[PDB]
């Protein structure tokens, strides 16, 4: 009887309409609405189900020590619903009156106080989010939403939206064994199982959103064992060789994203490590310690086979130079799926250094500063070469 609550990310997708077409209770099925605490001004209760996120209902009576705001939606006919998507008001006072704690009750008739509890839940992350509240699929003629706790008490609702059960969605959420998404569930643990699943999924409205995870599972099933090599590191200048770059350097355009685990100092942000300028650099905000190592992750648009990583520090004084480097590969777009491919060391030097290791396929690369000059970490450039 505990609701599973999460941010409703689908909001920002071009698959939304198509998704709503199949799973949203349509507006022509929502008959009427009322609520026990009136309205403030002309933030009327119809504005809670008017289909427009930019209009809201606000109560005229705030939650106090002795009053709980509730809203009751009547459907045109009995309707099987498993999820509510809800936001608080989204204007100047964004988030005010969010239902931090709520309960959902069903009735199968049009009148009377015969409500039975369907679900309870909380959300503490933010009050400004559009949230998906998921429970056992239940029949409703009337649905009651109680504002058990309402941020700053003046309960509000941009919208309530209602969804039927999405069984293929629920199945897809069982693709992996846990949230680190690094192990395929037994259900899907062969390429043939996975293909069957994908085929099962092809006509679904958000099919294209499931492709990534399916591809991730495919890469995990076909992964080889970790077997890292001692990389060779030396000073190089072939990066100056434009013609050679055209043939052997991975285009900067193949970088999807870069992040790092230690924030940054001042104006030395992480993008400066990949701007094809040896004079700009990223510098961490967090020192290497007994408990911490600086790590940089780069994700690629398209898988790429590389045999060399080229890198440098800030050139002024070589502060943060990677004196010892661990290189990891992942063939997935996300999940804890990195395996160690190489390790090597080099004394701090001006200019750029290559780490050469065995040809490896990368969807993402992690670059770990195992040991670093003055325990800092900087990158003027980070470049990727093919065999």
Give whole-number Cα distances, 45 to 106, 160, 319, in Å.
19, 11, 61
Q: Does 277 bind Ca ion (CB under 5 A)?
A: yes
Q: Is residue 226 near Ca ion by the rule CB under 5 A?
A: no
Shortest reach from residue 20's CB to Ca ion, in Å: 15
The window from 152-160, 177-185, 193-201, 260-268 that contacts Ca ion (CB under 5 A) reads 152-160
Please check if 55 is assigned to a binding site: yes
| Single residue of 3, 5, 50, 172 touching Ca ion by CB under 5 A | 50
# binding residues, Ca ion (CB under 5 A): 11
158 labelled ligand-binding: yes
In whole angstroms, the minimum distance from the beta carbon of 310 to Ca ion comes to 12
Choose, by CB under 5 A, the member of 70, 103, 132, 159 that binds Ca ion: 159
96 among the known binding-site residues? yes
Q: Is 52 in the site for Ca ion (CB under 5 A)?
A: yes
Least Cβ distance, residue 50 to Ca ion (angstroms) = 5
How distant, in Å, are the alpha carbons of 110, 158, 166, 358 from that of 104? 16, 18, 19, 57
Answer yes or no: is 381 a known binding residue.
yes
Interface with Ca ion, residue 280, by CB under 5 A? yes
Q: Does 55 bind Ca ion (CB under 5 A)?
A: yes
Are 321 and 372 a contacting pair, CB within 8 Å? yes
- From the list 101, 165, 275, 323, which residue makes contact with Ca ion (rule: CB under 5 A)? 275
Instruction: For Ca ion, give the closer residue by CB, 143 or 329.
Output: 143
Q: How far is the CB of 10 from Ca ion (least distance, A)?
A: 18
In the chain the first and final C-alpha atoms are separated, in Å, by: 56
Smallest separation, CB 352 to Ca ion (Å)? 11
Taking the least distance from each CB to Ca ion, the nearer of 119 and 280 is 280
Nearer Cβ to Ca ion (22/277): 277
What are the residues binding Ca ion (CB under 5 A)? 47, 50, 52, 55, 159, 272, 275, 277, 280, 380-381
Residue set of the binding site for N-acetyl-alpha-D-galactosamine:
58, 89, 96
Residue set of the binding site:
47, 50, 52, 55, 58, 89, 96, 158-159, 272, 275, 277, 280, 380-381
Residue set of the binding site for Ca(2+):
47, 50, 52, 55, 158-159, 272, 275, 277, 280, 380-381
């Amino acid at each position: 009887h505990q609701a599973r609550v999460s941010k409703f990310d689908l909001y920002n997708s071009d698959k939304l309409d198509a998704y709503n077409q199949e799973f949203q209770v349509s507006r022509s099925n929502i008959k009427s609405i009322n609520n026990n605490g009136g309205k403030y001004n002309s933030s009327t209760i119809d504005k809670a189900i008017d289909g427009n996120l930019e209009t809201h209902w606000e109560t005229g009576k705030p939650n106090d020590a002795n009053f709980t705001n509730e809203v009751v939606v009547t459907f045109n006919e009995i309707t099987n619903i498993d999820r509510i998507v809800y936001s608080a008001r989204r204007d100047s006072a964004r988030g005010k009156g969010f239902a931090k704690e709520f309960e959902i009750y069903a009735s199968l008739k049009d009148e009377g106080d015969d409500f039975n509890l369907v679900s309870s839940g909380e959300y503490t992350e933010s009050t400004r989010d559009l949230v998906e509240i998921k429970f056992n699929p239940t029949d409703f003629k009337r649905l009651k939403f109680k504002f058990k706790k309402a941020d700053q008490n003046w309960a509000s609702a941009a919208e309530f939206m209602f969804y039927k059960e999405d069984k293929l969605n629920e199945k897809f959420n069982g693709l992996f064994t846990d949230s680190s998404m690094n192990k395929v569930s037994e259900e899907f643990n062969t390429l043939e199982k996975l293909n069957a699943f994908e085929n099962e999924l092809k006509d679904h409205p958000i099919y294209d959103l499931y492709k990534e995870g399916l591809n991730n599972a495919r890469a995990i099933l076909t992964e080889t064992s970790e077997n890292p090599t001692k990389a060779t590191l030396g000073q190089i200048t072939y990066n100056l060789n434009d013609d050679y770059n055209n043939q052997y350097r991975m285009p900067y355009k193949n970088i999807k994203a870069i992040k790092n685990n230690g924030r940054h100092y001042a104006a030395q942000n992480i993008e400066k490590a990949i701007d094809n300028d040896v004079n700009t650099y990223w510098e961490t905000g967090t020192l290497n310690s007994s408990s911490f190592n600086n790590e940089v992750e780069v994700e690629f648009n398209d898988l790429v086979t590389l045999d060399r990583i080229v890198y440098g520090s800030r050139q002024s004084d070589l502060k943060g130079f990677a004196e010892e480097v661990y290189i990891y590969a992942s063939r997935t777009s996300k999940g804890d799926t990195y395996k160690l491919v190489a390790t090597g060391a080099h004394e701090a030097t001006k200019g750029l250094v290559e780490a050469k290791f065995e040809p490896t396929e990368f969807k993402r690369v992690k670059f770990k500063f195992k040991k670093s000059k003055q325990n800092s970490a900087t990158l003027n450039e980070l470049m990727f070469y093919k065999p």
